[PDB]
Design an enzyme around this catalytic site. Structure first.
Site, short mmCIF file in Angstrom:
data_model
loop_
_atom_site.label_atom_id
_atom_site.label_comp_id
_atom_site.label_asym_id
_atom_site.label_seq_id
_atom_site.Cartn_x
_atom_site.Cartn_y
_atom_site.Cartn_z
N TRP A 5 2.68 -23.35 -3.76
CA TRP A 5 1.96 -22.02 -4.31
C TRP A 5 1.63 -22.03 -5.71
N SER B 295 0.00 -21.70 -8.99
CA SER B 295 -1.33 -22.06 -9.40
C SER B 295 -1.39 -23.19 -10.37
N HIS C 1 -23.12 12.72 4.23
CA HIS C 1 -22.25 13.03 5.23
C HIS C 1 -20.85 13.22 4.87
N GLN C 2 -20.07 14.35 5.42
CA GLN C 2 -18.67 14.37 4.66
C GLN C 2 -17.80 13.42 4.92
N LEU D 173 0.75 -9.70 -1.47
CA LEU D 173 1.49 -10.78 -0.88
C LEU D 173 2.11 -11.71 -2.10
N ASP E 111 2.36 -13.08 -6.39
CA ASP E 111 2.97 -12.34 -7.44
C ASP E 111 4.19 -11.90 -7.19
N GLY E 112 4.99 -12.29 -6.36
CA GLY E 112 6.21 -11.60 -5.84
C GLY E 112 5.69 -10.71 -4.85
C1 LIG Z 1 -0.84 -12.88 -13.08
C2 LIG Z 1 -1.57 -13.34 -11.74
C3 LIG Z 1 -1.42 -14.86 -11.79
C4 LIG Z 1 -0.67 -15.09 -10.21
C5 LIG Z 1 -0.83 -16.54 -9.76
C6 LIG Z 1 0.50 -17.00 -9.26
C7 LIG Z 1 1.34 -15.95 -8.88
N1 LIG Z 1 2.10 -15.36 -8.41
N2 LIG Z 1 0.48 -17.97 -8.36
C8 LIG Z 1 1.76 -18.63 -8.44
C9 LIG Z 1 2.20 -19.43 -9.45
O1 LIG Z 1 1.68 -19.55 -10.30
N3 LIG Z 1 3.56 -19.93 -9.47
C10 LIG Z 1 4.43 -19.37 -8.52
O2 LIG Z 1 5.59 -20.07 -8.64
N4 LIG Z 1 3.79 -18.86 -7.24
C11 LIG Z 1 2.73 -18.33 -7.22
N5 LIG Z 1 2.17 -17.75 -6.17
C12 LIG Z 1 3.06 -17.45 -5.09
C13 LIG Z 1 3.55 -15.88 -5.17
O3 LIG Z 1 3.98 -15.49 -6.31
C14 LIG Z 1 4.46 -15.48 -3.93
O4 LIG Z 1 4.39 -13.93 -3.95
C15 LIG Z 1 5.80 -15.93 -3.83
O5 LIG Z 1 5.52 -17.34 -3.12
C16 LIG Z 1 6.78 -15.16 -3.16
O6 LIG Z 1 6.37 -14.90 -1.76
P1 LIG Z 1 6.98 -13.58 -1.01
O7 LIG Z 1 6.05 -13.47 0.28
O8 LIG Z 1 7.29 -12.38 -1.92
O9 LIG Z 1 8.70 -14.08 -0.50
P2 LIG Z 1 9.09 -15.09 0.48
O10 LIG Z 1 10.42 -15.43 -0.10
O11 LIG Z 1 7.99 -16.22 0.90
O12 LIG Z 1 9.54 -14.02 1.78
C17 LIG Z 1 8.48 -13.69 2.67
C18 LIG Z 1 8.66 -12.27 3.27
O13 LIG Z 1 10.16 -12.13 3.96
C19 LIG Z 1 10.75 -10.83 3.78
N6 LIG Z 1 11.94 -10.91 2.80
C20 LIG Z 1 12.32 -11.99 2.59
N7 LIG Z 1 13.58 -11.64 1.83
C21 LIG Z 1 13.55 -10.23 1.93
C22 LIG Z 1 12.55 -9.74 2.66
N8 LIG Z 1 12.37 -8.64 2.89
C23 LIG Z 1 13.48 -7.60 2.44
N9 LIG Z 1 14.39 -7.95 1.55
C24 LIG Z 1 14.62 -9.32 1.25
N10 LIG Z 1 15.83 -9.65 0.63
C25 LIG Z 1 9.14 -9.87 3.10
O14 LIG Z 1 8.85 -9.32 4.12
C26 LIG Z 1 8.63 -11.32 2.36
O15 LIG Z 1 7.31 -10.79 2.18
C27 LIG Z 1 0.79 -17.82 -5.98
C28 LIG Z 1 0.39 -17.50 -4.67
C29 LIG Z 1 -1.15 -17.46 -4.67
C30 LIG Z 1 -1.68 -17.33 -3.11
C31 LIG Z 1 -2.02 -17.84 -5.67
C32 LIG Z 1 -3.55 -17.71 -5.58
C33 LIG Z 1 -1.48 -17.87 -6.87
C34 LIG Z 1 0.11 -17.86 -7.08
C1 LIG Z 2 -3.76 27.34 -11.28
C2 LIG Z 2 -2.83 28.15 -10.69
C3 LIG Z 2 -3.21 29.38 -10.30
C4 LIG Z 2 -2.98 29.56 -8.63
C5 LIG Z 2 -3.36 31.12 -8.46
C6 LIG Z 2 -4.60 31.50 -7.53
C7 LIG Z 2 -5.37 30.28 -7.23
N1 LIG Z 2 -6.21 29.46 -6.74
N2 LIG Z 2 -4.49 32.56 -6.72
C8 LIG Z 2 -6.03 32.89 -6.65
C9 LIG Z 2 -6.47 33.66 -7.75
O1 LIG Z 2 -5.91 33.95 -8.64
N3 LIG Z 2 -7.85 34.18 -7.33
C10 LIG Z 2 -8.44 34.02 -6.36
O2 LIG Z 2 -9.62 34.45 -6.25
N4 LIG Z 2 -7.96 33.22 -5.32
C11 LIG Z 2 -6.80 32.72 -5.18
N5 LIG Z 2 -5.88 32.11 -4.32
C12 LIG Z 2 -6.96 31.77 -3.06
C13 LIG Z 2 -7.22 30.24 -3.11
O3 LIG Z 2 -7.91 30.08 -4.53
C14 LIG Z 2 -7.80 29.76 -1.83
O4 LIG Z 2 -8.00 28.19 -2.35
C15 LIG Z 2 -9.02 30.17 -1.83
O5 LIG Z 2 -8.94 31.40 -0.97
C16 LIG Z 2 -10.43 29.42 -0.92
O6 LIG Z 2 -9.61 29.01 0.30
P1 LIG Z 2 -10.21 27.76 1.23
O7 LIG Z 2 -9.28 27.54 2.63
O8 LIG Z 2 -10.54 26.61 0.17
O9 LIG Z 2 -11.72 28.32 1.55
P2 LIG Z 2 -12.06 29.03 2.97
O10 LIG Z 2 -13.51 29.58 2.52
O11 LIG Z 2 -10.80 29.79 3.46
O12 LIG Z 2 -12.11 27.85 3.99
C17 LIG Z 2 -11.20 27.41 4.76
C18 LIG Z 2 -11.37 26.06 5.38
O13 LIG Z 2 -12.66 26.13 6.04
C19 LIG Z 2 -13.11 24.59 5.89
N6 LIG Z 2 -14.54 24.89 5.59
C20 LIG Z 2 -14.94 25.80 5.12
N7 LIG Z 2 -16.31 25.54 4.59
C21 LIG Z 2 -16.41 24.16 4.54
C22 LIG Z 2 -15.20 23.73 5.13
N8 LIG Z 2 -14.90 22.37 5.13
C23 LIG Z 2 -16.06 21.42 4.89
N9 LIG Z 2 -17.35 22.15 4.22
C24 LIG Z 2 -17.39 23.25 4.21
N10 LIG Z 2 -18.67 23.75 3.50
C25 LIG Z 2 -12.19 23.87 5.17
O14 LIG Z 2 -11.46 23.13 6.22
C26 LIG Z 2 -11.32 24.78 4.59
O15 LIG Z 2 -9.89 24.65 4.29
C27 LIG Z 2 -4.67 32.19 -4.27
C28 LIG Z 2 -3.91 31.91 -3.14
C29 LIG Z 2 -2.49 31.78 -3.02
C30 LIG Z 2 -1.72 31.75 -1.54
C31 LIG Z 2 -1.98 31.99 -4.11
C32 LIG Z 2 -0.32 32.04 -4.17
C33 LIG Z 2 -2.37 32.19 -5.38
C34 LIG Z 2 -4.05 32.17 -5.56
#
Ligand SMILES: [C][C][C][C][C][C](C#N)N1=C2C(=O)[N]C(=O)N=C2N([C][C]([O])[C]([O])[C]([O])[C]OP([O])(=O)OP([O])(=O)O[C][C]2O[C](N3[C]=NC4=C3N=[C]N=C4[N])[C]([O])[C]2[O])C2=[C]C([C])=C([C])[C]=C21
Ligand SMILES: [C][C][C][C][C][C](C#N)N1=C2C(=O)[N]C(=O)N=C2N([C][C]([O])[C]([O])[C]([O])[C]OP([O])(=O)OP([O])(=O)O[C][C]2O[C](N3[C]=NC4=C3N=[C]N=C4[N])[C]([O])[C]2[O])C2=[C]C([C])=C([C])[C]=C21
Ligand SMILES: [C][C][C][C][C][C](C#N)N1=C2C(=O)[N]C(=O)N=C2N([C][C]([O])[C]([O])[C]([O])[C]OP([O])(=O)OP([O])(=O)O[C][C]2O[C](N3[C]=NC4=C3N=[C]N=C4[N])[C]([O])[C]2[O])C2=[C]C([C])=C([C])[C]=C21
Ligand SMILES: [C][C][C][C][C][C](C#N)N1=C2C(=O)[N]C(=O)N=C2N([C][C]([O])[C]([O])[C]([O])[C]OP([O])(=O)OP([O])(=O)O[C][C]2O[C](N3[C]=NC4=C3N=[C]N=C4[N])[C]([O])[C]2[O])C2=[C]C([C])=C([C])[C]=C21
Lengths: 430, 430, 430, 431
Positions: free
Chosen positions: C168, C170, C312-313, C399, C401-402
Site C-alpha cells: 500500500w 504510496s 424542485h424541493q 478506508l 490513511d488509517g
Molecule cells: C496524506 C494523504 C496521503 C496518503 C497516502 C498514503 C496513506 N494513508 N498511502 C499509504 C502510505 O503512504 N503508507 C502506508 O503505509 N500506507 C498507505 N496506504 C494504506 C492506508 O493507510 C490504509 O488505511 C492502511 O492499510 C490501513 O488499513 P485499514 O483497513 O485501516 O486496517 P486493516 O488492518 O487493513 O484492517 C481492515 C479492517 O478490519 C477491521 N479492524 C481491524 N482491527 C480492528 C478492526 N475494527 C475494530 N477494531 C480493531 N482493532 C476494520 O474494519 C478495518 O477497516 C495507502 C492506501 C492507498 C489506497 C493509497 C492511494 C495511498 C496510501
Molecule cells: C433565537 C431564539 C429565539 C427563539 C424564540 C422564538 C423563535 N423562533 N419564538 C417565536 C418568536 O419569538 N416569535 C415568533 O413570531 N414565533 C416564534 N416561534 C415560532 C417559530 O418561529 C416557528 O418556527 C414558526 O411558527 C414557523 O413554524 P414552521 O413549522 O416553520 O412553519 P408552518 O407555517 O407552521 O409550517 C409547518 C410545516 O408545513 C410544511 N410546509 C409549509 N409550507 C411549506 C412546507 N414545506 C415545504 N415548503 C413549503 N412552502 C413544513 O413541513 C413545515 O414544517 C416560537 C416557537 C416556540 C415553540 C418557542 C419556544 C419560541 C418561539
C-alpha cells in the site's frame, strides 16, 4: 408465500380496534389527573379489568395451555392496533405476557396448571412480571469473569433464599406493592452471596428462576420484600416497574421453575427473544399513530399557502420515509414471529431473526415519529396534538426489552461469529 | 484564520457558567411545582430578574446603542453555557434579544433611543417579543397569490388599526398577559381585512412592523387585546408564547418601525437570520449536556461488567458521533456569526450561511441527544437523569425559529437558485 | 476568532488553481491510454515534474528546514484546489509529504539536511514514501500480545537487516521499482524474526524507523528488494503503492531515524495524525467537484420539464445537504490544522481533533458525491460526466490513511477513555 | 400468512444458482478484454445464448402466453441469485422482460401470439427493449404544459412516422445495431413535430406505443434509424443502451400496440411498476454479494490482531446493519410482487407498494455495499476483491428504472395525495 389475513386475523384486528377505541380512549381522563407513576398505574386498573373481560389476558397464553392465543401474527396485529391508540394498559397486557412466558415455555405440566390458572380465568386483574433487570445493569449478566446478577439464591433445606435488588420489571409489585400475581425472579446461584461469582465457572450454568406469588410474599417477613422506589419515566408514564429489594426472602423448592443452569438461562433467553420480535409491533403502533396524524394534517392543511402541504416535495419525502419504515418494520415482525413458530428451524436462526427485528423496528420507529413532527412543523410540539406523547413513548423501544447497543446487537454478533452460522436459513432453509 | 479566544471571550464564558451554576440551577425547584405553562413562566420571573442584575439583557444590545454586546461570538459562547445547564430564563433572554432586533437594525435613531431604553437600564424584568407567527402558519407568508399574514393593519388618521391573531411568539403577553414591554408586531397592510391579499401584489411590499408596549395596550379598549390560550409545550415548559387576538387595536403612527414595504420585510428577515445563526449555540448547549452526561456515565459505570462501558466499541462510536456533531456545529455557528458581522459580504452570502447553520446544528443536536441516551441505555429514560428533559427540549430546535423543512431550506434554496450565487463567497471572497 | 484569508493564503489558492487548470487538466489524455496501475503512474511523471517546477514539492517542507511551507492552512487550501480538479499527481505530492514527515519531525538536524536535500532543490522528480502498511493489516500493529508488524529489523554489526513485506505505501518503489528517493520503513525490532513478538513487552517499545534510499537499494543484492505486485485500485488509478518484499536487506546504522521504541512510534503517530487532518482537504476537493457539477447542471437543466431542476424541493434538499457537509468539513480541517500548530496544547488534544476530522470529513464526502449523483440522476452514471471517477475516488478516503473503523475511531476512543480527557480543550483551553 | 417456499421455488433457486456458477462465472474472462461498452456487450452473447438454452428467457413470459414464468416470487428468487454472482447477461434477461411487458399486458391475443413467439421458442438470442428514455430526460414526460416526449409520432396513410431520439434503453439496438428483435417505442402523438406540445391537453392522452422489429428497420432508409452513441457506464459495463435517432421512420399501423391515449400510458406505467418491484431483487443480489464477501473475510481474518475482526463491535455493527437492510429489502420485494399479483386490489395500492419497494431497496443496497467495504477496510478497494465492481454496479439502482428522486418519489407522492388514499390497503384490506 402468502400475506393474506384469515378471517380470524381480521377479527382479531377488529376486536383490538374496538377495544382500543371504546375502552382505551377513556384512560387518559383518569390517569392524567394523578401526581406520580404508581398513581397513574393504579388509575389504569379499571381498563386492565376491561382487557381481561375482553379476553385479552387469556389471549396471552397458548390454546394447549387453556388460553386463547391463536398465533403470534394475531398477537402482533392486536398489539399494533392497541399501541396506535394508547400504550397505557396495552403495556400491562404485554408485560404480563412476558412474565408468563417462562412458565409457558418450561416443560412442567404441574407448574403450568398451577401458576397460569388465574390468567386463563377471565376474572380479576392478575399481573405477571419477569424480574430480570437490576440497578447495576444486565447487558453483561452472562459475562464470564464478571460480577453477574446481584440478585442471588441459595438452597437452605427444602427452601431457596433470595438476596438482592431488581429495577425496571413491569408489574413486579402488583397494583398495591404486595406483589405481582406471578413473578419469575431470575437469580444467580450463590451459597455465599457476600463472595464474588467464581470467575472460572460459566455464568449461564448458575442461573435459577424462582416463581414468587403474593402468597409467597405474605408468608414472609414484611422487611424481606421492600419496594424502595418507582422510576418516573419519560413516556409510558402509567406503567409500574419498581426498585425491589429481597432480603432473606424464602421460596419453596416446589416454586423452582426448572433445574438451575443452562436450561434456566435458556427459558429466559427464549422468553426475551419472543418479546424482541413482538416489541416491533408496539413500535409500529406508536410510529403509525405519528405517521397517520402527520398524513391527515398534511392532506388537509395549507399552512397559510395555496395548497395542502403534502404537495411540497420535502414534506412528501418525510411521509414517504415514514411509510417505508412502517411497511418494512411490519414485514419484519411478521417474518420474525413466523420464524419463531417454525419447529423445523434451529434456535440460532430464530434468535438472529428476532434480534434483527428488535434492533431495526425500534431504531426506525424513533426516526418515523421525528420525521412526522418535522413535516407537521411547529404545531407538533404542543400537547393539543399526539406528538409530544408519542415522542416520549417511542424512545422507550430502542432502550427497553434489552437495549440495542448493549444486549441485542451483542446477541446477534455472537450468532454471526459461529462457524456454522447460516445467514439465510430462515428464508431459504438449511 | 484564527480560533483563539480573547480574555473577554473567556470571561463571557466564565460569567455565563457562574450565572447558570449559581442562579439557573435553582429554577427547577420553583417551576416544577406549578400546574401549567403560564404558572411555570411566572415562577421564572425572579431568575430573569437576576439575569438583568447580572447584565445579561443589556448584553443583548450593541454598544453603540447603549448596550454591552461585545460580539456575536461572545453571544454564542454565553448561549451555549446557559443552555448546557437550563433553558428556563435562558430562552426568555434570547427571545427578548430577537424582539429587540428589528429596532436594533432600523435606521431610526429616535426610535432606538425611545424603545431600547428600558432594556439597557439594568433594572426590572423587561420583556421583548417579535410577534410574527400565526395560527394558520407562516412558512408561506411571502408567497405571491397566497392568503398572506392574517394579522393585518390599516391606517386611520394618525393611527394604525391591527386586526388578527398571533400564536407562538415568545414573551408576547409579558408576565401577566398585559403585554411584553416591547412587541414588534408584523402585519400585512390591508385597508379592508375582509378582502383577500391582492394576488398581483408582491406580499413583501405590504409588510408593516408596529411597536406595541404595555402603554399601547392600556390605551385600548378591554377586549381589543385578548389572550385566547397558552400552548402546553413538550419541552421548554417554562416559556410563554401565547395565542393573541387583536380586535380594532389602535397604535400611534409614530410607533411604525419604518415605511411599510420591502424595508420592513428586510428588518424581519435580518432579525430571523441573525437568530438562525444564534439558535445553533442553543442546540449545542442542549446536546453538549447530553453528551457530557453520557460521557461521565460511560467512564465511571461498567453496567455490571468488568470494564467501563466507554471501553466497548459500540458505546465509544456513539460518543464519537456526538462529539463530532458538537464540534462541527460550534465551528459552523462561529463561522456564521462572523460572516454576519462582515461588512464586505453581501446579504445573500450572509443569509445562505445562516440558513445552513440553523439547518445543520438543529438537526444533529437531536441525533446527539438520542445517541447519548442509546449509549447510557435504560437509565437514560428515567427522570433522575437529565435526558428526558433534554430530549423534549432538543426537538424544539429544528421546528422553531423558522422550521428547517418549510422555511430555512426554502430560504437557502432560493439563494442557491439565483444566477449570481457564489457558493464559497464567505470563505474565499467574491 | 478570525476566518479571513491573507494575501499569501489567497495567492496559494490562485497558484494551486492555475497549476490544476493549466497542467493537471492534461494528465488524463496521457494516463487513460495506459494498461495497468504502474503504466498509468509512470505517465504522470511529466506532471509531477511540473509540480516540482511550480515549487509544490518544496512547499511540503517547512521553512526552517529549507522548504517553502507557509502553514497547514495554506497546505489545506492547496490540496482542496488540486483534488477538485485531478487527484492524479496531486496524490503523489501529498504522499511524498507524508513520506517526509518522520524526517521533518525528528530531533536530528544532520539527518534532516542529508535526506530532505533533494526535495528542496526544485529539480528532478523526487518521491518519498512512509512505508508502514502490510499485507496482513496494521490496525492492530500496537496490540500487546498480537503478532505485531511482520516487517522486522535486527542489528548485525554496523548495519540493520530488514525482513518482511509491505503493501500500500504510496510511491514506495519510485518511478521504476528501484525505490523511492526516500523511504521511511517502519519495522518491529526482532533479533530472531522466526520467533513471534514477545507477548510480555509493549509493542510500541520495539518500533524502529529506517531510512532507505535508492542508494541503499543499489548497495543490496537484486533479490533483497522485490516488488511482488501492484494493486489495481477502484479509484486513484494512477497511483503506485506496491507489494514489496525485503529479504536480508541491509541498511546502515547511520540511516536509523531515531532510538527504537516510543520515540520512533511517536514520530509515526505524529506523521499520521497530521495526515489525518490534511486528508479532509482532499476529500473536500473530490466532494466539491461533485457538488459543483451537480449545482451547475441543476441550475441549467430542466430535465424535459418547465423549470430548472434546482426548483424542485427534493433536488435542492440534496444540494443543501452537500453544501452543509462541505462547509462543516472545511471548518473542521482548518480547526484541526490550527490545533496541530498550537504549541500551548497537549498532544492528546491535537490527536483527538485530528481523529475527528479524518472520520467526519471522509465519511460525509462519500454521502456528498452519492447525493449529487442522485440529484443529477441517470446522466451522472455515464463517463461524459465526472461522477463515475469521483465515486471511485471518494471511496478511498474513509478506508486509507488509517481506516475510520479499525484505526481512527480506536485512536480517538483511547483518548476519550483517559482519566484526564478534556473534550473542549482545543476550543476553550485546558 | 406464510413465508415457506414451495419445491418449485426452491428448484428455481437451485437452477438459477447452477446457471450463475457454471455459466455466468465464465463471462468475465471474455468481456474483460474488450475495449468499449458495445464490444463488452457483444462478448456476452454466448452467455445470453446459454440463458435461452436454460429456459430463462422463456421464464420471463407468463404460462398463459406460452412462457414458463411460475410467479413473480419465482422471478425474484432467480434475479437475486443471478445478480449475487454476475450482472452481465443477467441484466440483458431482465431488460428483455421489461421490453416484453407492454405486449404481455396488452389485451390483444393476435399481437401477443405474433410478437412473443421468438421469446418463448427456447432458441436463438432474441432481445427486447422498452424504448422510453430520452437525451433531455423523462422525469417530466407527463407534465401538463411541459415539452413532453421528444420522440413523436404522426399517422400518414396506413402508417406511423417516428421522429426523435431515445437514450438509455437496454438492448434497443440489438447485438449489431440493426435493432432489438422487439422494441416497444414510446412516442408522443404530434401532427407537426416542430410545434410544441399543446399546454391545454393532458400529456397522457397523447401517448402511443409502436412495435419496431428488425424487419421494420430493414424496410426503412438507412438514415432513418441511426445509433449516434453508446454511453460508457460506471458499472454494468457489459450492457448496451444506445443513443438512437429516428428520422421519418415508418411503422405499419398494424404495429400500434393499442389506441393512443390513457390506455397506452397505462401499459407503460404498469410495465415500469412491475420492474420497480423486481429491481429490488437485483439490488439485493449485488448488496448480498458485498455482505457475504465481507462476512467471510471478517470471520477468517484477524488483520494482524489476535482475533477475527467480526469479534470487534464496530465490525459486527456494520455486518448487522448490512444483514438488516438485506432482510428488510427481500421481505419488501416479496410483499410488492405478491401485491401486484393480487386481483382484489386497486391499481393505486399496487403502484404505491411498488414505488416504496424500488425507493427503499435501491437506496439501502448502496449503504450495504459501502458498509461492507468499510468493515473489510483497505483491501476492499483493490480489484482482487469484488467490491470495486459491486460499488459501481450498486449505484446504478437508485438511478435507473425511474430514478428515486425525480420519478418514484413523485409517483408515490401523487398516490398519497389522493382523497381516497388507503395507506394500509395492501395489508389490512380495503374499507
Ligand atoms: C496524506 C494523504 C496521503 C496518503 C497516502 C498514503 C496513506 N494513508 N498511502 C499509504 C502510505 O503512504 N503508507 C502506508 O503505509 N500506507 C498507505 N496506504 C494504506 C492506508 O493507510 C490504509 O488505511 C492502511 O492499510 C490501513 O488499513 P485499514 O483497513 O485501516 O486496517 P486493516 O488492518 O487493513 O484492517 C481492515 C479492517 O478490519 C477491521 N479492524 C481491524 N482491527 C480492528 C478492526 N475494527 C475494530 N477494531 C480493531 N482493532 C476494520 O474494519 C478495518 O477497516 C495507502 C492506501 C492507498 C489506497 C493509497 C492511494 C495511498 C496510501
Ligand atoms: C433565537 C431564539 C429565539 C427563539 C424564540 C422564538 C423563535 N423562533 N419564538 C417565536 C418568536 O419569538 N416569535 C415568533 O413570531 N414565533 C416564534 N416561534 C415560532 C417559530 O418561529 C416557528 O418556527 C414558526 O411558527 C414557523 O413554524 P414552521 O413549522 O416553520 O412553519 P408552518 O407555517 O407552521 O409550517 C409547518 C410545516 O408545513 C410544511 N410546509 C409549509 N409550507 C411549506 C412546507 N414545506 C415545504 N415548503 C413549503 N412552502 C413544513 O413541513 C413545515 O414544517 C416560537 C416557537 C416556540 C415553540 C418557542 C419556544 C419560541 C418561539
Ligand atoms: C414484551 C415487551 C414488554 C417489555 C416490558 C419489559 C421489558 N423489557 N419491562 C421489563 C420487564 O418486564 N422485566 C425486566 O427484567 N426488565 C424490564 N425492562 C428493562 C429493560 O429490559 C432494559 O432493556 C434492561 O434493563 C436492560 O437495559 P440496557 O440499557 O440494555 O442494559 P444495561 O446493562 O443497563 O447497559 C446500558 C448501556 O450500557 C452499554 N453497554 C453495557 N454493556 C455493554 C454495552 N455496550 C456494548 N457492549 C456491552 N457489553 C450499552 O450502551 C447499554 O445501552 C423494562 C423497562 C421499561 C422502561 C419498561 C417500561 C418495561 C420493562
Ligand atoms: C428491471 C429491469 C431493468 C431494465 C433496465 C432499464 C431500466 N430502467 N434500462 C432502460 C430501458 O430498458 N428503457 C428505458 O427507456 N430506459 C432505461 N434506462 C433509463 C432509466 O430508466 C432511467 O431511470 C431513466 O432515464 C430516468 O432517469 P431519471 O434520472 O429518473 O430522470 P431524468 O429525467 O434524467 O431526471 C434526472 C434528475 O432530475 C431531477 N428531477 C427531474 N424532474 C424532477 C426532478 N426532481 C424532482 N421532481 C421532478 N419533477 C431528479 O433529481 C432526477 O434524478 C436504463 C438505464 C441504465 C443505466 C440501464 C443499465 C438500463 C436501463
Amino acid at each position: 408465500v402468502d400475506f393474506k389475513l384469515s378471517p380470524s386475523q381480521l377479527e382479531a384486528r377488529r376486536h383490538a380496534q374496538a377495544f382500543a377505541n371504546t375502552v382505551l380512549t377513556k384512560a387518559s381522563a383518569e390517569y392524567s389527573t394523578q401526581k406520580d407513576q404508581l398513581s397513574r398505574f393504579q388509575a389504569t386498573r379499571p381498563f386492565y379489568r376491561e382487557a381481561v373481560r375482553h379476553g385479552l389476558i387469556k389471549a396471552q397464553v397458548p390454546i394447549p395451555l387453556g388460553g386463547t392465543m391463536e398465533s403470534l401474527v394475531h398477537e402482533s396485529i392486536i398489539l399494533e392496533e392497541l399501541f396506535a391508540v394508547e400504550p397505557a394498559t396495552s403495556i400491562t397486557i404485554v408485560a404480563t405476557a412476558l412474565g408468563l412466558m417462562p412458565v409457558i415455555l418450561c416443560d412442567s405440566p404441574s407448574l403450568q396448571e398451577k401458576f397460569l390458572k388465574p390468567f386463563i380465568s377471565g376474572e380479576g386483574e392478575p399481573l405477571a412480571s419477569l424480574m430480570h433487570s437490576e440497578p447495576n445493569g444486565t447487558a453483561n449478566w452472562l459475562q464470564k469473569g464478571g460480577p453477574g446478577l446481584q440478585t442471588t439464591a441459595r438452597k437452605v433445606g427444602n427452601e431457596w433464599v433470595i438476596s438482592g435488588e431488581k429495577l425496571w420489571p413491569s408489574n413486579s409489585g402488583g397494583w398495591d406493592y404486595k406483589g405481582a400475581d406471578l413473578a419469575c425472579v431470575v437469580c444467580r446461584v450463590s451459597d455465599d452471596p457476600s463472595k464474588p461469582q467464581d470467575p472460572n465457572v460459566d455464568p449461564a450454568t448458575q442461573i435459577a428462576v424462582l416463581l414468587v406469588t403474593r402468597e409467597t410474599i405474605a408468608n414472609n417477613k414484611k422487611d424481606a420484600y421492600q419496594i424502595l422506589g418507582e422510576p418516573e419515566l419519560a413516556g409510558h408514564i402509567t406503567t409500574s416497574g419498581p426498585h425491589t429489594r429481597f432480603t432473606e426472602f424464602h421460596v419453596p423448592h416446589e416454586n423452582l421453575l426448572c433445574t438451575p443452569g443452562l436450561k434456566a438461562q435458556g427459558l429466559v433467553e427464549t422468553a426475551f427473544a419472543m418479546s424482541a420480535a413482538l416489541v416491533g409491533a408496539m413500535a409500529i403502533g406508536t410510529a403509525r399513530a405519528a405517521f397517520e396524524e402527520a398524513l391527515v394534517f398534511a392532506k388537509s392543511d395549507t399552512r397559510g399557502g395555496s395548497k395542502h402541504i403534502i404537495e411540497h416535495q420535502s414534506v412528501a419525502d418525510k411521509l414517504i420515509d415514514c411509510k417505508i419504515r412502517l411497511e418494512t418494520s411490519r414485514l419484519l415482525v411478521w417474518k420474525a414471529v413466523t420464524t419463531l413458530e417454525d419447529e423445523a428451524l434451529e434456535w440460532k436462526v430464530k434468535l438472529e431473526m428476532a434480534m434483527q427485528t428488535k434492533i431495526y423496528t425500534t431504531d426506525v420507529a424513533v426516526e418515523c415519529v421525528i420525521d412526522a413532527m418535522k413535516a407537521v412543523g411547529m404545531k407538533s410540539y404542543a400537547k393539543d396534538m399526539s406528538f409530544p406523547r408519542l415522542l416520549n413513548e417511542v424512545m422507550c423501544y430502542p432502550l427497553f426489552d434489552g437495549g440495542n447497543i448493549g444486549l441485542r446487537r451483542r446477541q446477534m454478533q455472537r450468532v454471526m461469529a459461529l462457524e456454522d452460522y447460516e445467514p439465510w436459513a430462515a428464508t431459504y432453509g438449511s
